[PDB]
Amino acid sequence: LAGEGISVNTGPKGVINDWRRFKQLETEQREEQCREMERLIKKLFLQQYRKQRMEEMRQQLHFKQVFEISGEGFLDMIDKEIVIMVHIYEDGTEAMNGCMICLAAEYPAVKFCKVKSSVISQFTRNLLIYKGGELIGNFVRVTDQFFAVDLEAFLQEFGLLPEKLVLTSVRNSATCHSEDSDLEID
Amino acid sequence: EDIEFICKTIGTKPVAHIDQFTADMLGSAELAEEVNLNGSGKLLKITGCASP
Amino acid sequence: LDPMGGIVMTNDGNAILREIQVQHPAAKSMIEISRTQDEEVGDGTTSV
Amino acid sequence: PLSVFGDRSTGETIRSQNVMAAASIANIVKSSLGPVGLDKMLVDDIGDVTITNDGATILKLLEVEHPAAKVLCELADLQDKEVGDGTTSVVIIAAELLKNADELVKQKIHPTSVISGYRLACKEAVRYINENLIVNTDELGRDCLINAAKTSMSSKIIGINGDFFANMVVDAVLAIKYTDIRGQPRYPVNSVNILKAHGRSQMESMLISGYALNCVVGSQGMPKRIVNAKIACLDFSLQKTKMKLGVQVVITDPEKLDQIRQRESDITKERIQKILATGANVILTTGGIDDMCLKYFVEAGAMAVRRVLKRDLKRIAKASGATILSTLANLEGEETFEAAMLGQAEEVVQERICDDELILIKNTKARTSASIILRGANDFMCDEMERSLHDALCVVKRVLESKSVVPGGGAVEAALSIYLENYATSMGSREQLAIAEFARSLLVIPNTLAVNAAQDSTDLVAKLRAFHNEAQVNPERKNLKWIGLDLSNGKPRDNKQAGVFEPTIVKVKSLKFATEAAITILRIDDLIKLHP
Ligand SMILES: Nc1ncnc2c1ncn2[C@@H]1O[C@H](COP(=O)(O)OP(=O)(O)O)[C@@H](O)[C@H]1O
Ligand SMILES: [Mg+2]
Ligand SMILES: [Mg+2]
């Protein structure tokens, strides 16, 4: 057993196809694991808010549903295209889901959505915030620290929810192009 | 990057300060019209130039 | 039963239909019809 | 041997795959052709529902992976952009052309010969259409425009409603007519603001003899109806004055802070006083208006509308004779506003439309403008009505610009098929088959029309071809060129007297675009798909 200076030379040349086919899937798996582990492990009478009640019965005045994400769905939802809150749960979850549904009406610029925990048990036996592809809020097990007003106040105290709408008939816009508007001549 | 091409095509000499902006540094042209391509977009054409 | 935890107890057609979430787009069209009838005249929502 | 990190298809495999993709795209929209066509209901997998018959909308909404299918979808989009009608017909014709061309290629006919034959057939078809099948609209009058609009609105949600919608479309198009230099009557469609609102029925949609804004007054203080309006169009926000980045306020003597703060809003106060001193009644601005300026307008007894869309403001200024003013700066370095920049209208009202309000600028002087308020049963119906209305407006614009129309109902297609299958024998030895296949593929339109009505396509198309052959053979039977298809009774019918017309530009552009797309797809006999 000698000749440790193998100089494998054109050996790997004949296997670049299979090696790269395996490497593409390996890179995809590594990216998925990194995105999954981006949140996890990393950190895994004025005082009574008199305005809470008024916000409560002014929030109900609109009802659609939050998008249910498919392992690559989480990857390609944030990879492309703003503040985004993502909910992790497996079927207190219903209460905060209703809170997110209520908040989505007042925040059209946000992309409220939910995703199963199974598709993505150390974090399961007993709210993720993204913006522009980078993590902003990583509040896990929020029950330790509800209503839609409470969630809104909690997110605003951290300076994450955007700060603050007339209702049209139904809609006006049709398209956007060289409309060739009227140009009165002579 | 298009400054050299524009100056060669028309004859306009670029001006970087209003002090030197004089009439002799202008490129005379016969017509400068922006046309539409049957709703596929808009193009500005400068067709016909003195000393092309 | 409101998903936010509230309770809506009524017999108005529009109030009942507005709280129902459906998947078949024909049902969505019917619910939009109910909403249109409620917004236009404000009565006859079950009849339409 | 190649060692290319990807998949490769070559020969009959890739050609058959491309024809497969084109045929699938054609079959997607084949069921939405002709008056006996039916709409489609698209769901955007988040609950959003779209109901439409327009081919371009369907192809844009669908998710497409195959490159040839993408080519056909972009072809439909281009046809919609350049003409506005016949979006399904061009896709169907292109797919049928590709299918027949591949059938020829599989018989060891070289694709270059097929492409040359297709080019010759397209040129000859355009020439024959222009020479024979066109009908001048000068001697027809408004009836021709009404019939063209009605034919365009067939197969749409406003089909039976055509008797009224055609009149509305013709009036709206004629209201915006203008003549530019060279004395060419130009009709600027898309300047007609189409507003939608559910509620009342289709029959009682409103055509506005003016302009309609999807906006309301900024505050409840101002009146919601002004008779002798003096519209002042502005392109700037009327808010408290704030210095730009290069200006910074530094105070050393404390006694001047109050003066600074007072001037900070007195500047805007003076601007509003200058604007209102000339007699302005309605003020429209693209920028925002804060509370103090709204109070000024309320006290002046005027109207203030904020966040007006730029295109809407430009149209209002053009119609009423007003001029957009991004600033009140004149050539003397001063800050003045003159009455010459005021636009006038006969009435400005905030009308109520189904629990919501919108502003109607009725009867603007110095220029006529139009807007359409579509009333329907729900959002989907109103959106489909808007799409159909846009198609009708485009058709009317094409008819009014180019004064040539052709009979509908597949009469043009049958005449072209007969003439081309007769002409193919005149010249060529191998492209003759290509021209014959072009002629045969041109018959896919009447075939689809007959199929959609559950009528015997074979007998109807045979009778149509016999009529057109008699027209092309007997000199005294040239009046049979207008024999189209009557889908209500499933019998051939003279469409020229029946009032079924299409612009010639629609057929010509559809033929050219379909031929070019078929040629583009036909040139491929090898595909390399690299792994991502
Ligand atoms: N009343 C009618 N009788 C017979 N044929 C008609 C009638 N109206 C329209 N057609 C034909 O039906 C064909 C399909 O039109 P359609 O598909 O609705 O337009 P588009 O292709 O723009 O969607 C047209 O080519 C036209 O010639
Ligand atoms: Mg009742
Ligand atoms: Mg059409």
Experimental method: cryo-EM
D290 catalytic? Reply is: no
Taking CA atoms only, the protein residue closest to ligand 1 atom 5 is D409
Residue D87 counted as an annotated binding residue: yes
Residue D85 is encoded by which pair of tokens?
């009608």
Burial of D7 per CB tally in 10 Å (0-12, 13-18, 19+): exposed
Query: In angstroms, rounded to a whole number, what is the distance separating the alpha carbons of residues D141 and D149?
Result: 13
Q: Show the 3-state SS of chain C.
A: CCCCCCCCCCCCHHHHHHCCCCCCHHHHHHHHHHHHHHHHCCCCCCCC
In terms of CA atoms, which chain C residue is nearest residue D354? Answer: C40
Query: In angstroms, rounded to a whole number, what is the distance separating the alpha carbons of residues A31 and A26?
Result: 9
CA D78, D136, D33, A177: dihedral to nearest 10 degrees? 30
Query: In angstroms, rounded to a whole number, what is the distance separating the alpha carbons of residues D368 and D178?
Result: 10
Burial of D150 per CB tally in 10 Å (0-12, 13-18, 19+): buried
Query: In angstroms, rounded to a whole number, what is the distance separating the alpha carbons of residues D206 and D208?
Result: 6
Residue D18 host element (H or E): helix D12-29
D221: three-class secondary structure by DSSP: coil
Q: Are strands D282-285 and D229-234 parallel, antiparallel or unpaired?
A: parallel
Phi-psi region of D377 (alpha: psi -120 to 50; beta: other; left: phi over 0): alpha
Q: Which are the contacts of D30, defined by CB distance < 8 A and separation ≥ 6?
A: D88, D92, D448
D524: three-class secondary structure by DSSP: coil
Query: In angstroms, rounded to a whole number, what is the distance separating the alpha carbons of residues A96 and A151?
Result: 8
Give the residues across from D501 on adjacent strands: D407
Query: D483, D387, D517: which is closest to D93 by C-alpha?
Result: D517
CB contact under 8 A, A148 and C4: yes
Please list every residue in chain C whose beta carbon sits closer than 8 Å to the beta carbon of residue A98: 2-5
The alpha helices in chain A, defined as continuous H runs, are 16-39, 51-59, 71-79, 93-106, 148-157
Give the residues across from D406 on adjacent strands: D502
In terms of CA atoms, which chain A residue is nearest residue B38? Answer: A178
Decide: D526 and D14 in contact? Cβ < 8 Å: yes
The amino acid present at D292, given as its one-letter code, is M
**D429 touches A at CB < 8 Å:** no
Catalytic one of D52, D57, D80, D88:
D88
Query: D493, D507, D504, D430: which is closest to D118 by C-alpha?
Result: D430
Positive or negative: CA dihedral A154, A157, A162, A165: positive
Instruction: Give the nearest ligand 1 atom to D484 CA.
Output: 4
Give the residues across from D528 on adjacent strands: D8
Nearest CB to D358: which of A67, A169, A174? A169
Query: In angstroms, rounded to a whole number, what is the distance separating the alpha carbons of residues D239 and D230?
Result: 22
Query: In angstroms, rounded to a whole number, what is the distance separating the alpha carbons of residues D284 and D287?
Result: 9
Alpha-carbon distance values, D71 to D186, D516, D523 (Å): 32, 11, 13
Q: D35 φ, ψ to 5°?
A: -60, -25
Q: How far is A135 from chain C (nearest CA, A)?
A: 28
Residue C45 counted as an annotated binding residue: yes
Residue A80 is encoded by which pair of tokens?
């492309």
Residue A89: other Cβ atoms inside 10 A: 15
The amino acid present at D493, given as its one-letter code, is R
CB contact under 8 A, A98 and C5: yes
**C29 touches D at CB < 8 Å:** yes
CB contact under 8 A, B39 and D78: no
Enter the DSSP assignment of D57.
H
Q: How far is D355 from chain C (nearest CA, A)?
A: 6
Q: Are strands A83-89 and A113-116 parallel, antiparallel or unpaired?
A: parallel
CB contact under 8 A, D78 and B38: no
CA A120, A123, A127, A129: dihedral to nearest 10 degrees? -60
Distance of CA D283 to the CA centre of its chain: 31
Query: D56, D68, D64, D60: which is closest to D520 by C-alpha?
Result: D68
Burial D23-49 (b: 16+ CB within 10 A, else e): bebbebbbbbbbbbbebbeeeeeeeeb
Residue D219 is encoded by which pair of tokens?
């505050």
Q: D355 φ, ψ to 5°?
A: 65, 15
Residue D306 host element (H or E): none
Query: In angstroms, rounded to a whole number, what is the distance separating the alpha carbons of residues D390 and D153?
Result: 10
**D189 touches A at CB < 8 Å:** yes
**Residue holding tokens 């552009």?**
D509
The string of DSSP letters for A137-175 reads E----TT----HHHHHHHHHHTT-SPP-----SSB----
Residues in chain D: 532
The string of DSSP letters for D357-410 reads EEEEEEEESSS---EEEEEESSHHHHHHHHHHHHHHHHHHHHHHHS-EEEETTT
Alpha-carbon distance values, D13 to D8, D18, D526, D530 (Å): 10, 9, 9, 18
The amino acid present at D7, given as its one-letter code, is D
Query: In angstroms, rounded to a whole number, what is the distance separating the alpha carbons of residues A8 and A154?
Result: 60
Residue B18 host element (H or E): none
Query: In angstroms, rounded to a whole number, what is the distance separating the alpha carbons of residues D286 and D284?
Result: 7
Residue C36 counted as an annotated binding residue: no
D383 catalytic? Reply is: no
Alpha-carbon distance values, B35 to A22, B30, B31, B41, D82 (Å): 53, 15, 12, 9, 15
Ligand 1 site, CB within 6 A: D 33-35, 55, 85-89, 151, 154-155, 408-409, 449, 484-485, 487, 500, 502
Residue D436 host element (H or E): helix D431-441
Decide: D452 and D36 in contact? Cβ < 8 Å: yes
Please list every residue in chain A whose beta carbon sits closer than 8 Å to the beta carbon of residue B39: 177-178, 180
Catalytic one of D54, D312, D486, D494:
D54
Query: In angstroms, rounded to a whole number, what is the distance separating the alpha carbons of residues D212 and D348?
Result: 10
Residue A169 is encoded by which pair of tokens?
């008939």
The string of DSSP letters for D137-167 reads STTTTHHHHHHHHHHHHTTSTTSTTHHHHHH
**Residue holding tokens 């999954």?**
A36
Instruction: Give the nearest ligand 1 atom to D155 CA.
Output: 18
